[PDB]
Amino acid sequence: PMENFQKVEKIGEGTYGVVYKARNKLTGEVVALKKIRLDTETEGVPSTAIREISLLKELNHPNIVKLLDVIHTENKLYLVFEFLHQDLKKFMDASALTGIPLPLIKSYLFQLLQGLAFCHSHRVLHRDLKPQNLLINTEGAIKLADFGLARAFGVPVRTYTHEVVTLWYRAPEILLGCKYYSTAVDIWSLGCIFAEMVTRRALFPGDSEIDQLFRIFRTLGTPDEVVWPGVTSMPDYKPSFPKWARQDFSKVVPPLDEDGRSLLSQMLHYDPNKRISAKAALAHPFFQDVTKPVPHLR
Amino acid sequence: GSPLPVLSWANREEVWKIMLNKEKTYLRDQHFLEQHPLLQPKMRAILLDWLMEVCEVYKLHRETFYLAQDFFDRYMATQENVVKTLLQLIGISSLFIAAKLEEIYPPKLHQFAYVTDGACSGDEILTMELMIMKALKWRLSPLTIVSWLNVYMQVAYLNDLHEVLLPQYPQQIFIQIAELLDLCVLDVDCLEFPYGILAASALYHFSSSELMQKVSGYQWCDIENCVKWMVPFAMVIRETGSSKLKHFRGVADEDAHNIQTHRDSLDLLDKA
Ligand SMILES: CC(C)NC(=O)O[C@@H]1CC[C@H](c2cc(Nc3ccccn3)n[nH]2)C1
């Protein structure tokens, strides 16, 4: 079963299970392994595991991290993934003084949206986009990882698990207690992360659901039935919220050309209906350089 | 041909095609019970009817149900020569995988053993779930018979902003159609017809080939076969009168139509 693989070094143990970097002895093939201890489980193979497997089976794309095999031995399951060296937070951290080249920001954001555009058209939400779950290789690629909190959406979506997404990267519709939800939650994550990449500092580091909303508001402006129909009737909306003026985006992310600063605003529209899509983001002038259009049959 | 409106998140044709391309990769064989020569059709029927009952009592999702069916019928066509005794375990193992997949708060392993009245214990189920999952090759994301009916019902209520995400459609009509499919599935010859069409077919029986077409895309011809095959099963639903949407105080309201249900259907499948 596992006889060709030499654990070289462990790279992480969190909400994912265990994860060691492996060697293929005969090949010099470097993969990532996720170990799942089956014995420990009362409830058999975890819910989160059965999902992340069958999804990644049918989510083959260059900006998604690739599942390569599934191996069962001795009351231990092994997921075997395409391997990348660094994660986008430790990178963003390493380049906290120097800045990140805007060439590379743009390039990276692009590749993420292609991954997301792929998932969404495959009718799948990530629901835990965060620099920790964005992996970069040495050839300048970036790729979505960690589909444990992902979930397909029956095109007429139904009610999904309320509390998802790490607080900071979490979208105002989930915080204000929205019933149904869809693709626009992933975009807000990516928008937080764009701004992160620019300012090498998280856009909304809330220490609570209350702090997170207020931190958002202080930057985007206390929202009303104008900028976001429904907002006022929504469950965790209180008429008590203070009022803050939206701010100039030239201050909130100073380094960013109008082409960026626009894009970002549409990614952080309050109204999920109006929020930009993955596919449409690719169209934006910001990618004028990497944008190369095609024709359109009617 | 795609009956989806101009989508915002992706290319309506792109989305529909992926969905279609999916219903290939996912394969079924109406005549798989010949590889198990000692196995009879009328068996499969009673098992599926059992699973429904259990799905009801635990307020499981129809979707969960159909994931069970699908895991069963796909798995068996990877197997050879199986005994009637084994089928109680293979079905409720199937369901367990689904429940884990579809519910937020799925039932616990013992409750799943429980129902077997000893004949299957949690440890057996845990072994099975793994032979099944390695035998479908971890392909547990099929578009289900009911999955389509939800699509079609949503596409039947367009309004102005062609919003295909917020479910906006009447429960009693959904329930009434489900009832017809939830039968049709008991006879193995349905695997002949793709789930797209079975769902179309049934909707036509409660509507017309004009709605069917604007919701599904399928042309009167594409279905005629299964609407011919399905005729018998329709009469019986019509003869008895069609069901009232019930409420289960566990379950909210804007989900009550999605909760799987039961009625003898023994007497009813026979009448074809
Ligand atoms: C966020 C991640 C730890 N969790 C996760 O679910 O990732 C997937 C499963 C493992 C696979 C994977 C890891 C990997 N190396 C690295 C290198 C640096 C940082 C994190 N991981 N390369 N590929 C992808």
Q: Which residues pair with A34 in a beta bridge?
A: A19, A79
CATH of domain A5-81: 3.30.200.20
CA–CA separation, A265 and B221 (whole Å)? 49
CA–CA separation, B207 and A86 (whole Å)? 57
The closest residue, in CA terms, to atom 6 on ligand 1 is: A146
Q: Respond yes or no: is residue A128 known to be catalytic.
A: yes
CA atoms within 13 A of residue A248's CA, in its CB half-sphere? 7
Are the beta carbons of A279 and B151 separated by less than 8 Å? no
The DSSP symbol for A96 reads T
Are the beta carbons of A120 and B9 separated by less than 8 Å? yes
| SS3 state at B171 | helix
CA–CA separation, B16 and B5 (whole Å)? 10
For residue B30, which of B187, B183, B179, B145 has the smallest C-alpha distance? Answer: B187
Are the beta carbons of B258 and A152 separated by less than 8 Å? no
Question: Would you list the domain boundaries of chain B?
Answer: 11-27+142-272, 28-141
Handedness of CA A45, A47, A50, A56 (dihedral sign): negative
The distance of B48 to chain A (nearest Cα, Å) reads 23
CA–CA separation, B210 and B212 (whole Å)? 5
CA–CA separation, A195 and A253 (whole Å)? 6
Q: How far is CA B229 from the centre of its chain?
A: 18
Joined tokens for residue B155: 């596409």
Is B126's Cβ below 8 Å from some Cβ in A?
yes
Confirm if A53 and A3 have CB atoms less than 8 A apart: no
Radius of gyration of chain B (CA): 18
Confirm if A148 and A52 have CB atoms less than 8 A apart: yes
CA of B124 to the centre of ligand 1 (A): 33
| CB-neighbour burial class of residue B121 (10 A; exposed 0-12, middle 13-18, buried 19+) | middle
Which one is catalytic: A128, A207, A259, A289? A128
The closest residue, in CA terms, to atom 9 on ligand 1 is: A146
Confirm if B28 and B72 have CB atoms less than 8 A apart: no
Residue A92 Cβ inside 6 Å of ligand 1? The answer reads: no
Q: Which residues contact B21 (CB under 8 A, 6 or more apart)?
A: none
- The resolution in Å comes to 3.0
Question: Would you list the domain boundaries of chain A?
Answer: 5-81, 86-291
Domain A86-291 has CATH 1.10.510.10: yes
Which experimental approach was used here?
Answer: X-ray
Amino acid A69 reads D
